[PDB]
Design an enzyme around this catalytic site. Structure first.
Site, PDB file in Angstrom:
ATOM      1  N   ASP A 205      -4.136  -1.831   2.013  1.00 61.84           N
ATOM      2  CA  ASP A 205      -3.488  -2.166   0.359  1.00 61.84           C
ATOM      3  C   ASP A 205      -2.490  -1.004   0.497  1.00 61.84           C
ATOM      4  OD1 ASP A 205      -4.388  -1.852  -1.563  1.00 61.84           O
ATOM      5  OD2 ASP A 205      -4.115  -0.251  -2.340  1.00 61.84           O
ATOM      6  N   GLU A 246       0.031  -5.737   3.253  1.00 63.22           N
ATOM      7  CA  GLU A 246       0.380  -6.236   1.992  1.00 63.22           C
ATOM      8  C   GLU A 246       1.262  -5.730   1.750  1.00 63.22           C
ATOM      9  OE1 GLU A 246      -1.107  -4.135  -1.281  1.00 63.22           O
ATOM     10  OE2 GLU A 246       0.944  -4.911  -2.087  1.00 63.22           O
TER      11      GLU A 246
END
Length: 490
Positions: A205, A246
């Site tokens: 993330d 990501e």
């Protein structure tokens, strides 16, 4: 070098589910029950959005990874699911909850805390720990100020630490110093915990934010970011884990990551498919399919919004970006902005079904395009159930992204799966999981601008998608077990 480490990469090529731990029935046990009741051969894997105890941002301010949030279940619930599905979990490489023991100890003891070095105290960026406005102005900010002030209990002194994200001030999300040996040990312990319970893929993330450097944007700072990525990839592999990065950025950054052997998300396809269907033109889609890496995780919807800037920078002009954005907003969407000047739309917050005007045929066409695009296909739980924009959650929470994060009870799931559009989607998903041609060669076929023709071939198996964009009629011509060509009307 090119595609480093990928000689051994062989991911299961089946549709995956993205869900919150509590959004299908309330917890991991009801999630497992729902998967067993309706979806056992519908999904080959499940991305469970952060299920650890968290102090904000619906899971993305984790307090600890050593337990699952007890409202949701236990690590053994994950282990049991991993017996039937590939499990993908998040590692918040950029930040940890201020309520973690590490940061609470620091707030108690200040620099005499053994964990002080895990955090980006501002003295690590400026000699005297004093922020410089001119330097902040160069940064890609995700909140008004990229730091927060806390009171050290034992000294009474005020201390600033870096906090890239956080809707409250002070933020709940304290940035980790990935240069700290203590942080690398911490992240390694999470890999070990994940691996112990069967987790095979880990989403990094906000990985683009981990390198802070004065004078830069502090987003995807090269070459330093690659030193962390290389380190993390090798350590994760030691525990049997593949990393999924990501990164919302211009396409050159994503493509270089893939070129260097990192798995990425396809953040261009969601908008590209919307434009394709709204404008009844394959031109952007065909240009993208011919010029993209194939080792991507594809999606239409996810837990965030539909990417616009920077993900589509240089690929669409403002006129066409604004056309699609404005149409989505007329269909109930709200917008996440970059944050006064210029086009500054970061993401379109909208269910994908609502974004297509709840046009069942166009929505099935969208998923067919997704499933025929090379890459590992993911289906977000709201889109699985053809969910529409949740205005109640928006009005009550004043959080625009909650439009696409409805929590379903068991009875509502029971009702939703009976909808014709959902039954059509489930049949398409199972076709994508069962038909062997998707594991073979991909061919983009010539056709009219208002058509889509894509073909997969393996051995005597072949399936050819045809979409008439005038009507959104979606047909798959395929070779059955007897060698006969059969027409599947999606």
């Amino acid at each position: 070098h090119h595609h480093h480490g990928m000689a051994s990469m062989a991911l299961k090529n089946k549709v995956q589910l993205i869900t919150y731990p509590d959004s299908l029935g309330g917890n991991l046990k009801t999630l497992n029950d729902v998967l067993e009741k309706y979806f056992s051969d519908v999904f080959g894997g499940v991305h469970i959005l952060p299920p650890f105890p968290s102090s904000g941002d619906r899971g993305f301010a984790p307090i600890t990874y050593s337990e699952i949030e007890p409202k949701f279940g236990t690590w053994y619930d994950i282990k049991k699911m991993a017996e039937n599905f590939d499990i993908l979990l998040d590692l918040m490489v950029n930040h940890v909850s201020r309520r973690s023991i590490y940061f609470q100890d620091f707030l108690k003891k200040g620099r005499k805390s053994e964990y002080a070095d895990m955090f980006i105290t501002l003295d690590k960026l400026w000699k005297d720990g004093k922020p410089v406005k001119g330097d902040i102005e160069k940064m890609f900010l995700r909140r008004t100020l990229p730091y927060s002030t806390f009171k050290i209990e034992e000294t009474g002194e005020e201390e600033k630490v870096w906090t890239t994200f956080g809707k409250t001030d002070p933020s709940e999300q304290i940035d980790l110093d990935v240069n700290s040996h203590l942080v690398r040990e911490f992240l390694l312990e999470v890999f070990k915990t994940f691996s112990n319970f069967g987790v095979k893929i880990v989403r990094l993330d906000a990985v683009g934010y981990v390198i802070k450097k004065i004078g830069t944007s502090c987003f995807f700072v090269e070459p330093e970011i690659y030193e962390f990525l290389d380190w993390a990839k090798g350590q994760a592999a030691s525990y049997g884990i593949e990393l999924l990065l990501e990164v919302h950025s211009q396409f050159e950054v994503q493509y270089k990551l893939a070129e260097r052997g990192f798995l990425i998300y396809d953040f261009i396809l969601p908008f590209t498919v919307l434009y394709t269907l709204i404008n009844k033109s394959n031109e952007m889609l065909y240009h993208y399919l011919k010029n993209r890496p194939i080792n991507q995780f594809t999606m239409l919807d996810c837990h965030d919004g539909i990417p616009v800037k920077p993900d589509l920078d240089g690929l669409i002009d403002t006129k066409k970006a604004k056309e699609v954005v404005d149409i989505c907003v007329q269909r109930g969407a709200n917008l996440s902005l970059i944050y006064e000047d210029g086009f500054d739309v970061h993401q379109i917050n909208c269910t994908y079904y609502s974004a297509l005007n709840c046009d069942d045929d166009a929505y099935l066409a969208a998923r067919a395009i997704q499933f025929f695009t090379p890459g590992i296909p993911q289906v977000y739980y709201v889109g699985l159930l053809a969910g529409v924009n949740d205005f109640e959650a928006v009005k009550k929470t004043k959080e625009g992204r909650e439009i696409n994060r409805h929590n379903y009870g068991l009875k509502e799931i029971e009702e939703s799966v009976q909808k014709n559009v959902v039954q059509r989607l489930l049949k398409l998903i199972r076709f994508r999981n069962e038909y062997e041609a998707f594991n073979g060669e991909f061919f983009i076929e010539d056709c009219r601008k208002d058509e889509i023709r894509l073909t997969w071939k393996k051995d005597d198996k072949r399936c050819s998608l045809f979409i008439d964009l005038k009507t959104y009629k979606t047909t798959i011509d395929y070779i059955n077990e007897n060698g006969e060509e059969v027409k599947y009307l999606v």
